[PDB]
Design a binder for this molecule. Structure first.
Ligand code: K
Ligand code: MG
Ligand code: MG
Ligand code: MG
Ligand code: MG
Ligand code: MG
Ligand code: MG
Ligand code: MG
Ligand code: MG
Ligand code: MG
Ligand code: MG
Ligand code: MG
Ligand code: MG
Ligand code: MG
Ligand code: MG
Ligand code: MG
Ligand code: MG
Ligand code: MG
Ligand code: MG
Ligand code: MG
Ligand code: MG
Ligand code: MG
Ligand code: MG
Ligand code: MG
Ligand code: MG
Ligand code: MG
Ligand code: MG
Ligand code: MG
Ligand code: MG
Ligand code: MG
Ligand code: MG
Ligand code: MG
Ligand code: MG
Ligand code: MG
Ligand code: MG
Ligand code: MG
Ligand code: MG
Ligand code: MG
Ligand code: MG
Ligand code: MG
Ligand code: MG
Ligand code: MG
Ligand code: MG
Ligand code: MG
Ligand code: MG
Ligand code: MG
Ligand code: MG
Ligand code: MG
Ligand code: MG
Ligand code: MG
Ligand code: MG
Ligand code: MG
Ligand code: MG
Ligand code: MG
Ligand code: MG
Ligand code: MG
Ligand code: MG
Ligand code: MG
Ligand code: MG
Ligand code: MG
Ligand code: MG
Ligand code: MG
Ligand code: MG
Ligand code: MG
Ligand code: MG
Ligand code: MG
Ligand code: MG
Ligand code: MG
Ligand code: MG
Ligand code: MG
Ligand code: MG
Ligand code: MG
Ligand code: MG
Ligand code: MG
Ligand code: MG
Ligand code: MG
Ligand code: MG
Ligand code: MG
Ligand code: MG
Ligand code: MG
Ligand code: MG
Ligand code: MG
Ligand code: MG
Ligand code: MG
Ligand code: MG
Ligand code: MG
Ligand code: MG
Ligand code: MG
Ligand code: MG
Ligand code: MG
Ligand code: MG
Ligand code: MG
Ligand code: MG
Ligand code: MG
Ligand code: MG
Ligand code: MG
Ligand code: MG
Ligand code: MG
Ligand code: MG
Ligand code: MG
Ligand code: MG
Ligand code: MG
Ligand code: MG
Ligand code: MG
Ligand code: MG
Ligand code: MG
Ligand code: MG
Ligand code: MG
Ligand code: MG
Ligand code: MG
Ligand code: MG
Ligand code: MG
Ligand code: MG
Ligand code: MG
Ligand code: MG
Ligand code: MG
Ligand code: MG
Ligand code: MG
Ligand code: MG
Ligand code: MG
Ligand code: MG
Ligand code: MG
Ligand code: MG
Ligand code: MG
Ligand code: MG
Ligand code: MG
Ligand code: MG
Ligand code: MG
Ligand code: MG
Ligand code: MG
Ligand code: MG
Ligand code: MG
Ligand code: MG
Ligand code: MG
Ligand code: MG
Ligand code: MG
Ligand code: MG
Ligand code: MG
Ligand code: MG
Ligand code: MG
Ligand code: MG
Ligand code: MG
Ligand code: MG
Ligand code: MG
Ligand code: MG
Ligand code: MG
Ligand code: MG
Ligand code: MG
Ligand code: MG
Ligand code: MG
Ligand code: MG
Ligand code: MG
Ligand code: MG
Ligand code: MG
Ligand code: MG
Ligand code: MG
Ligand code: MG
Ligand code: MG
Ligand code: MG
Ligand code: MG
Ligand code: MG
Ligand code: MG
Ligand code: MG
Ligand code: MG
Ligand code: MG
Ligand code: MG
Ligand code: MG
Ligand code: MG
Ligand code: MG
Ligand code: MG
Ligand code: MG
Ligand code: MG
Ligand code: MG
Ligand code: MG
Ligand code: MG
Ligand code: MG
Ligand code: MG
Ligand code: MG
Ligand code: MG
Ligand code: MG
Ligand code: MG
Ligand code: MG
Ligand code: MG
Ligand code: MG
Ligand code: MG
Ligand code: MG
Ligand code: MG
Ligand code: MG
Ligand code: MG
Ligand code: MG
Ligand code: MG
Ligand code: MG
Ligand code: MG
Ligand code: MG
Ligand code: MG
Ligand code: MG
Ligand code: MG
Ligand code: MG
Ligand code: MG
Ligand code: MG
Ligand code: MG
Ligand code: MG
Ligand code: MG
Ligand code: MG
Ligand code: MG
Ligand code: MG
Ligand code: MG
Ligand code: MG
Ligand code: MG
Ligand code: MG
Ligand code: MG
Ligand code: MG
Ligand code: MG
Ligand code: MG
Ligand code: MG
Ligand code: MG
Ligand code: MG
Ligand code: MG
Ligand code: MG
Ligand code: MG
Ligand code: MG
Ligand code: MG
Ligand code: MG
Ligand code: MG
Ligand code: MG
Ligand code: MG
Ligand code: MG
Ligand code: MG
Ligand code: MG
Ligand code: MG
Ligand code: MG
Ligand code: MG
Ligand code: MG
Ligand code: MG
Ligand code: MG
Ligand code: MG
Ligand code: MG
Ligand code: MG
Ligand code: MG
Ligand code: MG
Ligand code: MG
Ligand code: MG
Ligand code: MG
Ligand code: MG
Ligand code: MG
Ligand code: MG
Ligand code: MG
Ligand code: MG
Ligand code: MG
Ligand code: MG
Ligand code: MG
Ligand code: MG
Ligand code: MG
Ligand code: MG
Ligand code: MG
Ligand code: MG
Ligand code: MG
Ligand code: MG
Ligand code: MG
Ligand code: MG
Ligand code: MG
Ligand code: MG
Ligand code: MG
Ligand code: MG
Ligand code: MG
Lengths: 48, 275
RNA sequence: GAGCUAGCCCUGGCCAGGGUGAAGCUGGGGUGAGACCCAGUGGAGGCCCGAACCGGUGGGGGAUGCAAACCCCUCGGAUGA
RNA sequence: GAAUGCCGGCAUGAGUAACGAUAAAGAGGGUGAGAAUCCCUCUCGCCGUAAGCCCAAGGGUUCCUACGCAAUGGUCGUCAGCGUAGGGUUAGGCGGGACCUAAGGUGAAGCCGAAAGGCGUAGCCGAAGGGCAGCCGGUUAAUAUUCCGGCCCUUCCCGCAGGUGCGAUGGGGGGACGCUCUAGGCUAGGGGGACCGGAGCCAUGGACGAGCCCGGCCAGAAGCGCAGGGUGGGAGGUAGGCAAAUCCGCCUCCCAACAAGCUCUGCGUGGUGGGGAAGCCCGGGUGACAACCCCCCGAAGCCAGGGAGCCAAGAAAAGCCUCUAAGCACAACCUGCGGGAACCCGUACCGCAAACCGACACAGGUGGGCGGGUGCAAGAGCACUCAGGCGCGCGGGAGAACCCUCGCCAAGGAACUCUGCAAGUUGGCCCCGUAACUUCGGGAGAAGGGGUGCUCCCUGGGGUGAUGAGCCCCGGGGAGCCGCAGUGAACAGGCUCUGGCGACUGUUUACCAAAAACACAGCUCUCUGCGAACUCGUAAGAGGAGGUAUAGGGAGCGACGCUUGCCCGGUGCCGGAAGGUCAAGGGGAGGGGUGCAAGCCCCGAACCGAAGCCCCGGUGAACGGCGGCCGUAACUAUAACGGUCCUAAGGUAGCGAAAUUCCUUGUCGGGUAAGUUCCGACCUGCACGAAAAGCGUAACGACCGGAGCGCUGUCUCGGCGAGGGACCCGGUGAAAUUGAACUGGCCGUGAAGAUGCGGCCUACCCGUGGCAGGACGAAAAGACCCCGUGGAGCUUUACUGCAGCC
RNA sequence: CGAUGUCGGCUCGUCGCAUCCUGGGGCUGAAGAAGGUCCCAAGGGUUGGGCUGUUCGCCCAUUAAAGCGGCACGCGAGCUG
RNA sequence: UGGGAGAGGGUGGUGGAAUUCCCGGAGUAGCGGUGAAAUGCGCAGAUACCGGGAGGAACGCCGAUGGCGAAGGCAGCCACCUGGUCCACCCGUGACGCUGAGGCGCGAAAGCGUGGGGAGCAAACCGGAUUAGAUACCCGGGUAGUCCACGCCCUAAACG
RNA sequence: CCGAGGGUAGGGCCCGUGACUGGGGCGAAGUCGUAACAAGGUAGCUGUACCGGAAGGUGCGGCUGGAU
């Protein structure tokens, strides 16, 4: 049947993207936390 | 004069429609329509604040003139009478001799190709608008301002009307469509005559679908829900209300008055409503 | 977290073919005028049959599956909420 | 040494299940160390509203070529969506941006919030919507509306000519709109041709034919022709379109009017440029100077912003046009012509799937366009088949039980069983014919029945065309032919009678419930006078609603028909400016502490003092409730009648062994040979009853009862047959489970159900196909029950708080 | 209670005997026939239907007869539900 | 042709008396009701009186033993639209008439549907008396209805 | 070809019968009340409506076949 992952690049960028994170206090702490942890990528890769 | 259908389907049994006899023009004045934003009963939070709304036909709002004192002494001609999907009443299109065009709500008996006008010296003739202090006591009247220059607020719905019962100082006394007696300031404008389309209430929707066309989504009973949802929720099998009948939010709903007690307008309401 | 799901908003798209034949309209009869009757025209509808599409009624299979809900047969809706 | 411990390793089950749709394969020839599996050929089968072709999303080199086979591929592999390498994506016109707005988002102004932040007008952003200039062919191993060829077009800059009051982010017009039905004329596409072009063919009995087979076009600027859309002209007045205005709007007047004219689009033609089959021979060459014509069918697409009807009344903004304002009228704009200028990103490949979403090359899911032909009434249905694409990445044998899917069956025909579950039967079209009841539509495809193919003859109407031929579309009549059978294959209702429930179409527990549940039109109560009530929010602010009592909220009931009785003592709500009670505060009789004293300080009665509660009333489609005992009639039996106790009042109409009846299979009647079910009645209703509505109701229902007819492998009662498995051989090779095991029966015993203890009996060692009685077999630390001063959801006249409200 | 699946049916049986029938008997208030009661006896047999989920029971038509119990109210790694 | 009387009918208007309710004033201890009472209302200020307001229904006197209509029926006043009828003149048509099965239309009250309206009245219903009982007569309340619009019903001691 | 009739299916009319049910007629001496006839002790009758063990009552309108 129809499963839960239905990829959509605009959706992905506008939801989890860098600019989305930066707009929100909660978003910025996510970036802060992932940098502190040393994540190679702070944000989901999407080809735009 | 409502139109009926033959029983060629189960819903065409009882379904009735307006006759649309008074209508003379079937597509709106383009300079007087602007888009109506359908809300779905949701506020700027995204939240439903009025349950069971949405999914109705698309509509264009028609800008109505509810402050006819705008143009005192300038007569206008009744160009046409049109359908308005945003209200129960019909609307009338006016060609002012000024060149300007406006919509007003159509009073009962208003005929196309007649002059109407607004102001203190206006004739007491169906369609004209005056301050209440210049309208003869006993005259039925609609689209009444509740405060001077604030706009017509009272008696707007199809078939409705207010009657002037007397005067007292700067104020006149009106019997509202509801039966309430109220003082309204003399300077408040109002249009002589009753609103038209009085057969509006005799329309039988006929099926669930006509409700949906009007933007009315299904209404679910408290009794049909669970305790988490509603006071009437739950019960094993059917159940009487089992407590005083209440809204979803707990307040009682058979008889509990809700008009704020210390409201300043109380000084101006002579007698609460009938029936 | 509403890329699943539920509701709403904005903007687009889709519904083979066949059947029934409402109002109205025209003509004819009727009457003081009417109601109304008959025929023709007409093409209404949460109308009918049935693909696409949307479903999931009954049964069988499957049951370390092809599948963490599937397959076959049958069945519901199909201009409408 | 144990924790269903943790990490790792390796066993068992076992050479076992399985190898992923039953659309299907066989041979020959190549390549190579090696071939059922790679390449080629011939044969065979499958898809063909796709299992073919083109977009979009998502994927991200998977594309092409060479060289490879360790792993990946459910087998193999020389092959590959795999490994290594090199190559491959070309745009002013396609899509997006340098244009416009939609919801929504953001947000100068402004509002609000302890902080973080939330709002918010304009503006800005935001698309699969608006707007905007490219079609046909050729070429590469791989790109092409992009390269090339032909013919077209847009914007910007500058210049020239001609014309004009030029000029705007401002005014106005326009853009600009729904649903259903639908006209005329075209085009897409298709069928036919005895006409035109073609390599060839004559078989096996016949045919050298008016024979078979193949094909008979595509694009195109101006002009022209056909068909459409859009659109009145002039003048005078003018206070409105937030300055102005010659524009627009309004009024008057003349002319024009189903037209014309002007303009815009589609189509045809059109200079020119392309294409071009079968077959033969090696993707190419020939065919070929290829021919490129006639008739018919014909869109849902085009003309298009067409027309009609209807109610539920159907985006915006820019481009474009007009008006003017500052300003400037050496300018500036408009038109035509010329040269110049024209940027950024996408472009490979997959794309109903082995490349996307499902851990897999996974029988699942995935939006848009094209989707040919013949026949069946139509069609995207169904059977076959074109182009095109496939035979589904284990095979070979065998011909057992059993399982799955399928075919048939003597006589019987529901006797099966909880149940006709299942499977038969019926089945399309045309014609005849069709009941109770009904809300007059329906019920209705009721029921039942006749026809249905092919041949010859006669004839009727329509479309095209020309009025005719030809072609095509509907028919009527007569005479015959064949078979068991003519919707000869495929797709295609079994029917009726009678109850319960729900009016109806709808809706629901994604993944055990589709229903009698929810919804529903409709009825009633109730709140709400608008800065409405109500709802979300601390707020601002929103929804309500740019609505105004014929409206909006809440509640119950649930089409319609006929109806909805009595009780207001209690609870709720509603009314009652009195009385009672009543907090902070007012008041300060009268006390207390301290000081030498003024004083400073504390307690404090009466009395005044809100809502709330008390008290007085109202109110049932508000929460709710609607009796007991005893007696009485001239046969008996039974009580219309009476007595008395109690209650706020004692169940009214209708219905009743019921979706409700315990006793119960009540009793009687019907149906049956037989009826705990069903149907109709009776009424001692354990324990119906009137909007948690009462009693009915045509129509409707994948709802739940009962009966009959038809027909059946459901059954008596089983038999045979087909294919896919199961079986044997070659290849690959799991799983849960498992203290170790050298693991028999009886009767006992044992923690009470023993392979394991006792006595006896029986038994050579090891397997394979089978069946499921045991191993208190496996799986899940029982979901029932209890226990825990464990948890959580829910309720209320449990406690105590908080929002909110007074 | 770190699970011993719980009614009934179907299928397949097997055992007990306190015997329903068939065989052998004694007593009889046994004339014959047909019965009654008790004894011996488990070899074989012990029907098809209507109703209900039923076991059971009632009922129809038969019969030599239409037996009663055990096997985890025998039997769901056998089926049904 | 010329005249007359009339509550004949339909439509739109409009007048005063009275009942009830509401606000104000003034005022106190009862009012109401009956055969007698009680229920009921009244110190929360009733009844009675004055002023103001809201609304519905019916039209006193004229009024009669009257008039009009085919019947049912029709009563303030005004206007509009309309029916029948009688009298005068003796002018016109020249038997054009009577009746009338079916048909069609009208048809008091009650009652029904959909809206409205609602003062008074009043089935049902409640309460107080009476009574052996009192599902009545009498008293206090009171809902349909009585009123309007449109549409049905079509009955009657529709009687002379 | 027609054709008696036979068969399948569906209708219409009539008769007989049916648990149970509705009222009706009749029947020497049952029970309850007293509605009508007198102003019948509330004048009666009336069409209709609602109510009530029963006769009846009440509303609305109508008749005198109503006493004084
Ligand atoms: K339990
Ligand atoms: Mg889903
Ligand atoms: Mg997942
Ligand atoms: Mg999605
Ligand atoms: Mg996207
Ligand atoms: Mg996208
Ligand atoms: Mg998105
Ligand atoms: Mg989205
Ligand atoms: Mg976001
Ligand atoms: Mg983002
Ligand atoms: Mg922060
Ligand atoms: Mg920060
Ligand atoms: Mg890095
Ligand atoms: Mg992130
Ligand atoms: Mg109707
Ligand atoms: Mg009708
Ligand atoms: Mg109208
Ligand atoms: Mg109209
Ligand atoms: Mg606009
Ligand atoms: Mg809006
Ligand atoms: Mg917003
Ligand atoms: Mg709400
Ligand atoms: Mg809503
Ligand atoms: Mg309107
Ligand atoms: Mg005011
Ligand atoms: Mg209504
Ligand atoms: Mg609407
Ligand atoms: Mg509603
Ligand atoms: Mg509801
Ligand atoms: Mg509930
Ligand atoms: Mg529930
Ligand atoms: Mg919740
Ligand atoms: Mg709660
Ligand atoms: Mg609650
Ligand atoms: Mg409850
Ligand atoms: Mg419940
Ligand atoms: Mg419930
Ligand atoms: Mg219950
Ligand atoms: Mg209830
Ligand atoms: Mg309760
Ligand atoms: Mg409550
Ligand atoms: Mg509140
Ligand atoms: Mg009020
Ligand atoms: Mg989505
Ligand atoms: Mg459809
Ligand atoms: Mg038909
Ligand atoms: Mg027709
Ligand atoms: Mg028409
Ligand atoms: Mg339909
Ligand atoms: Mg299924
Ligand atoms: Mg089946
Ligand atoms: Mg799952
Ligand atoms: Mg499963
Ligand atoms: Mg399936
Ligand atoms: Mg199928
Ligand atoms: Mg079907
Ligand atoms: Mg259908
Ligand atoms: Mg269809
Ligand atoms: Mg639609
Ligand atoms: Mg240990
Ligand atoms: Mg552990
Ligand atoms: Mg571990
Ligand atoms: Mg491990
Ligand atoms: Mg290791
Ligand atoms: Mg290992
Ligand atoms: Mg091994
Ligand atoms: Mg094994
Ligand atoms: Mg396996
Ligand atoms: Mg498999
Ligand atoms: Mg298949
Ligand atoms: Mg196939
Ligand atoms: Mg071969
Ligand atoms: Mg082969
Ligand atoms: Mg090989
Ligand atoms: Mg090999
Ligand atoms: Mg090959
Ligand atoms: Mg060969
Ligand atoms: Mg095809
Ligand atoms: Mg398709
Ligand atoms: Mg991937
Ligand atoms: Mg390999
Ligand atoms: Mg290999
Ligand atoms: Mg290698
Ligand atoms: Mg591998
Ligand atoms: Mg695989
Ligand atoms: Mg090799
Ligand atoms: Mg490439
Ligand atoms: Mg180009
Ligand atoms: Mg630039
Ligand atoms: Mg804060
Ligand atoms: Mg954006
Ligand atoms: Mg766009
Ligand atoms: Mg649009
Ligand atoms: Mg473009
Ligand atoms: Mg072009
Ligand atoms: Mg350009
Ligand atoms: Mg401009
Ligand atoms: Mg428009
Ligand atoms: Mg518009
Ligand atoms: Mg429509
Ligand atoms: Mg063309
Ligand atoms: Mg064709
Ligand atoms: Mg010929
Ligand atoms: Mg050919
Ligand atoms: Mg051309
Ligand atoms: Mg001007
Ligand atoms: Mg000019
Ligand atoms: Mg050549
Ligand atoms: Mg289309
Ligand atoms: Mg168009
Ligand atoms: Mg149009
Ligand atoms: Mg906008
Ligand atoms: Mg100059
Ligand atoms: Mg110009
Ligand atoms: Mg640039
Ligand atoms: Mg490309
Ligand atoms: Mg593709
Ligand atoms: Mg698919
Ligand atoms: Mg597709
Ligand atoms: Mg592929
Ligand atoms: Mg999966
Ligand atoms: Mg595969
Ligand atoms: Mg073809
Ligand atoms: Mg067909
Ligand atoms: Mg295969
Ligand atoms: Mg396949
Ligand atoms: Mg094999
Ligand atoms: Mg074998
Ligand atoms: Mg198969
Ligand atoms: Mg055979
Ligand atoms: Mg047979
Ligand atoms: Mg049979
Ligand atoms: Mg038979
Ligand atoms: Mg049966
Ligand atoms: Mg059986
Ligand atoms: Mg069943
Ligand atoms: Mg068939
Ligand atoms: Mg019939
Ligand atoms: Mg019948
Ligand atoms: Mg019926
Ligand atoms: Mg009928
Ligand atoms: Mg049909
Ligand atoms: Mg024939
Ligand atoms: Mg033949
Ligand atoms: Mg020819
Ligand atoms: Mg069918
Ligand atoms: Mg029948
Ligand atoms: Mg239901
Ligand atoms: Mg239903
Ligand atoms: Mg019902
Ligand atoms: Mg019903
Ligand atoms: Mg309903
Ligand atoms: Mg319903
Ligand atoms: Mg439907
Ligand atoms: Mg479910
Ligand atoms: Mg669930
Ligand atoms: Mg569930
Ligand atoms: Mg679920
Ligand atoms: Mg689930
Ligand atoms: Mg299921
Ligand atoms: Mg259910
Ligand atoms: Mg269903
Ligand atoms: Mg539900
Ligand atoms: Mg419901
Ligand atoms: Mg109702
Ligand atoms: Mg109400
Ligand atoms: Mg809140
Ligand atoms: Mg608004
Ligand atoms: Mg009826
Ligand atoms: Mg009745
Ligand atoms: Mg009470
Ligand atoms: Mg009370
Ligand atoms: Mg109370
Ligand atoms: Mg001292
Ligand atoms: Mg109570
Ligand atoms: Mg209770
Ligand atoms: Mg009662
Ligand atoms: Mg009653
Ligand atoms: Mg009973
Ligand atoms: Mg019974
Ligand atoms: Mg019942
Ligand atoms: Mg029940
Ligand atoms: Mg009961
Ligand atoms: Mg019991
Ligand atoms: Mg019982
Ligand atoms: Mg029972
Ligand atoms: Mg019985
Ligand atoms: Mg009986
Ligand atoms: Mg019987
Ligand atoms: Mg009894
Ligand atoms: Mg109930
Ligand atoms: Mg029914
Ligand atoms: Mg029915
Ligand atoms: Mg249904
Ligand atoms: Mg159903
Ligand atoms: Mg049966
Ligand atoms: Mg069988
Ligand atoms: Mg076989
Ligand atoms: Mg062997
Ligand atoms: Mg091997
Ligand atoms: Mg392998
Ligand atoms: Mg051991
Ligand atoms: Mg051992
Ligand atoms: Mg052993
Ligand atoms: Mg052994
Ligand atoms: Mg023991
Ligand atoms: Mg033992
Ligand atoms: Mg042993
Ligand atoms: Mg041992
Ligand atoms: Mg031993
Ligand atoms: Mg020992
Ligand atoms: Mg032994
Ligand atoms: Mg073996
Ligand atoms: Mg074995
Ligand atoms: Mg076993
Ligand atoms: Mg077993
Ligand atoms: Mg164990
Ligand atoms: Mg076991
Ligand atoms: Mg076992
Ligand atoms: Mg499990
Ligand atoms: Mg645990
Ligand atoms: Mg446990
Ligand atoms: Mg557990
Ligand atoms: Mg326990
Ligand atoms: Mg405790
Ligand atoms: Mg404890
Ligand atoms: Mg606890
Ligand atoms: Mg829980
Ligand atoms: Mg808790
Ligand atoms: Mg246990
Ligand atoms: Mg365990
Ligand atoms: Mg276990
Ligand atoms: Mg013997
Ligand atoms: Mg024996
Ligand atoms: Mg038992
Ligand atoms: Mg048993
Ligand atoms: Mg029993
Ligand atoms: Mg014998
Ligand atoms: Mg036994
Ligand atoms: Mg036992
Ligand atoms: Mg037991
Ligand atoms: Mg057992
Ligand atoms: Mg089982
Ligand atoms: Mg069992
Ligand atoms: Mg087991
Ligand atoms: Mg076992
Ligand atoms: Mg069950
Ligand atoms: Mg007093
Ligand atoms: Mg006092
Ligand atoms: Mg009033
Ligand atoms: Mg008088
Ligand atoms: Mg004369
Ligand atoms: Mg009448
Ligand atoms: Mg009343
Ligand atoms: Mg009524
Ligand atoms: Mg008289
Ligand atoms: Mg015969
Ligand atoms: Mg007949
Ligand atoms: Mg009688
Ligand atoms: Mg007697
Ligand atoms: Mg008497
Ligand atoms: Mg008396
Ligand atoms: Mg009397
Ligand atoms: Mg009584
Ligand atoms: Mg009475």
């Amino acid at each position: 049947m129809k499963r839960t992952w239905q990829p959509n690049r605009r959706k992905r960028a506008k939801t989890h993207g860098f600019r989305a994170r930066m707009r929100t206090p909660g978003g910025r702490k996510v970036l802060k936390r992932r940098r502190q942890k040393g994540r190679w990528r702070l944000t989901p890769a999407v080809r735009k | 004069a409502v139109k009926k259908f033959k029983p060629y389907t189960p819903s065409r049994r009882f379904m009735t429609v307006a006759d649309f006899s008074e209508i003379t023009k079937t597509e709106p004045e383009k300079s007087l329509v602007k888009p109506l934003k359908k809300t779905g009963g949701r506020n700027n939070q995204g939240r439903i604040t009025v349950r069971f709304r949405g999914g109705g036909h698309k509509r264009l709002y028609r800008i109505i003139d509810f402050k006819r004192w705008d143009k005192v002494g300038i007569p206008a001609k009744v160009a046409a009478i049109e359908y308005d999907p945003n209200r129960s009443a019909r609307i009338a299109l006016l060609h002012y001799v000024d060149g300007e065009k406006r919509y007003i709500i159509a009073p009962d008996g208003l005929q196309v190709g007649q002059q109407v006008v607004a102001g203190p010296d206006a004739p007491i003739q169906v369609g004209n608008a005056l301050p209440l202090r210049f309208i003869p006591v006993g005259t039925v009247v609609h689209a009444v301002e509740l405060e001077p220059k604030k706009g017509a607020k009272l008696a707007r719905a199809a078939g409705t009307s207010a009657q002037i019962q007397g005067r007292e100082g700067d104020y006149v006394i009106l019997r509202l469509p509801s039966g309430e007696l109220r003082k309204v300031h003399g300077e408040c404008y109002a249009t002589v005559g009753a609103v038209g389309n009085a057969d509006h209430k005799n329309i039988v929707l006929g099926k669930a679908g006509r409700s949906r066309w009007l933007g009315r989504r299904p209404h679910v009973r408290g009794a049909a829900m669970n305790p988490v949802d509603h006071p009437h929720g739950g019960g094993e099998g059917r159940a009487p209300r089992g407590r005083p009948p209440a809204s979803p939010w707990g307040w009682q709903t058979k008889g509990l008055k809700t008009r704020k007690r210390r409201k300043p307008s109380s000084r101006f309401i002579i007698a609460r409503r009938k029936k």
